[PDB]
Amino acid sequence: PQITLWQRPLVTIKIGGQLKEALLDTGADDTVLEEMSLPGRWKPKMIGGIGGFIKVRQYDQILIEICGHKAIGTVLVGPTPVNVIGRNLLTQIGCTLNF
């Protein structure tokens, strides 16, 4: 797709057998989502840094589907106030900024 930015670029994502909504956020390095169960061995990760950090669970090699494009990569899971698709998974689906 080609997505304009008049409004927030919210998309529905397929992940862990469930549907969530997430923001395509080029300003985010990583992908962070609300609590859910995913497969694999996870380890804690401290994220943020500007004003403090929050702890999330890092799950690697997770499969996601965005707008019907599949990708594999790291998903951070925990109390995020905002579900974001970050650059790590944007690259995987071949998403670029164009003007």
Q: Residue 28 or 62: which CB sits closer to a second copy? A: 28
Going by C-alpha positions, the residue among 30, 13, 22, 19 that lies closest to residue 66 is 13
Instruction: Please report whether residue 40 would count as binding ligand LLG according to CB under 6 A.
Output: no
Contact 40, 62 (CB under 8 A): yes
- Is residue 32 at the binding interface for ligand LLG, with CB under 6 A as the rule? yes
Binding mask 54-93 for ligand LLG (x = CB under 6 A): x-------------------------xxx-x---------
Which residues pair with residue 22 across a beta bridge?
A: 11
Selected from 1, 17, 27, 68, the binder of ligand LLG by CB under 6 A is 27
Q: Alpha-carbon distance 99 to 80, whole Å?
A: 31
Could you list the active site residues? Answer: 25
